């Protein structure tokens, strides 16, 4: 047969991301000395829109403690953050929206975002519009913090890991219908080439496993094992259940 | 000669019109001329003192 569309995205020719109008990677500041012994102050200069991204970015300016210089940093803006706001980042910083405290030094129930899952990765969990991580508890010995992620998963991560206090801005974005193929087209014009989507069952069997037939039908089960190979995985991979979700997830 | 007769008002009836009234002269253009007239008059009068600012205001927003 022929190599199928999902196999063909890994080569990354026309499927790469369109990163022209992106302002940079939204990373936390490097964890150098001040953010693990005291705090460092920076200032929000502007909240800008990032192409390919619903959440706005904040350009925060800090000072270099070792050279006369004005290193700038690109944060994902949390809801309530404004221009001319002083951001405080570090161990001994105050529990206020926009600060970059560690997770050990916040109480339980605290709402944070852009959380390092490992100290020094400079930005992970809860980065998208409206998303946040909840702190649940602490293990001060075995210095660890349990957190609820937006998926519902519970995760144990280092107390030295950092997070921005508050909620990522842009919430409520998926509540509005697009109404238009064109609105979806402009959404995906700046992300990557993954739209429009042709149904495999509307194809020929050379092009897709679900292709073929004198009626449009999948034929075999659309539930594919995890131990299937590239070219077979087209459907519902490793589906524990299937169908309309009737009740609580029981997680 | 045709333009001189157009001036006198000829060759302008319903049978010599092929475009809409708005295509020939837009309602927005007529409105703009009219407001400009009224506002220019009101401002002339307020400056001359024939009218006070309190009457000018209600007449401005009425116009």
């Amino acid at each position: 047969g022929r190599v199928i569309r999902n196999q063909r995205k890994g080569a990354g020719s026309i499927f790469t991301s369109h990163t022209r109008l992106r302002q940079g990677a939204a990373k936390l500041r490097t964890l150098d000395y001040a953010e693990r012994h005291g705090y460092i102050r920076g200032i929000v200069k502007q909240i800008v829109h990032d192409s390919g991204r619903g959440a706005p970015l904040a350009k925060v300016v800090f000072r270099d403690p070792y050279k006369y210089r004005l290193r700038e940093e690109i944060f994902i803006a949390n809801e309530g953050v404004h221009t001319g706001q002083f951001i405080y980042a570090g161990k001994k910083a105050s529990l206020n929206v926009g600060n970059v405290l560690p997770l050990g030094s916040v109480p339980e129930g605290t709402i944070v975002s852009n959380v390092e899952e490992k100290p020094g990765d400079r930005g992970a969990l809860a980065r998208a519009s409206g998303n946040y991580v909840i702190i649940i508890g602490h293990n001060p010995d075995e210095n660890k913090t349990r957190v609820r992620l937006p998926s519902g998963a519970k995760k144990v991560i280092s107390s030295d890991a950092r997070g921005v206090i508050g909620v990522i801005a842009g919430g409520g974005r998926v509540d509005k219908p697009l109404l238009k193929a064109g609105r979806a087209f402009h959404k995906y014009r700046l992300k990557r080439n993954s739209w429009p989507k042709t149904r495999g069952v509307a194809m020929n069997p050379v092009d897709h496993p679900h292709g073929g037939g004198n009626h449009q039908h999948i034929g075999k089960a659309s539930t594919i094992s995890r131990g299937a190979v590239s070219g077979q995985k087209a459907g519902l991979i490793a589906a524990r259940r299937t169908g309309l979700l009737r009740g609580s997830q029981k997680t | 000669a045709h333009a001189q007769s157009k001036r006198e008002g000829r060759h302008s009836g319903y049978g010599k019109r092929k475009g809409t009234r708005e295509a020939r002269l837009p309602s927005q253009v007529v409105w703009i001329r009219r407001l400009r007239v009224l506002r220019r008059l009101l401002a002339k009068y307020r400056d001359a003192g024939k009218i006070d600012k309190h009457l000018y205001h209600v007449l401005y927003k009425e116009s």
């Binding site: 909240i47 619903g54 706005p56 809801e79 309530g80 842009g170 509005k176 109404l179 | -």
Partner: protein, 91 residues
């Protein structure tokens, strides 16, 4: 005068896309095209630049907010939660 009974700003879509979809869109379009009160200058001049960016014409301040409203209920709740926890560890 009143030009539409109930579609309002969604009259630009005419008869297309469905009434249920147009109601949802109306509810949020009114919000995102509205003017909001500035917490800093006290004026009714806050408007949306893009999704999540709310700028005031006077005072030129820019706040990160919701996509179609300045403040989400969740963010107000977080503001109050964090205020309560901050006043809890010092007190």
């Amino acid at each position: 005068a009143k030009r539409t009974k109930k579609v309002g700003i969604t009259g630009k879509y005419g008869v297309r896309y469905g009434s249920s979809l147009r109601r949802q869109v109306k509810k949020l379009e009114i919000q995102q095209h509205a003017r909001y009160d500035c917490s800093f200058c006290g004026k009714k001049t806050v408007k949306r630049g893009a999704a999540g960016i709310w700028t005031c014409s006077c005072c030129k301040k820019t706040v990160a907010g919701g996509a179609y409203t300045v403040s989400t209920a969740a963010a107000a709740t977080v503001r109050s939660t964090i205020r309560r926890l901050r006043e809890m560890v010092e007190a």
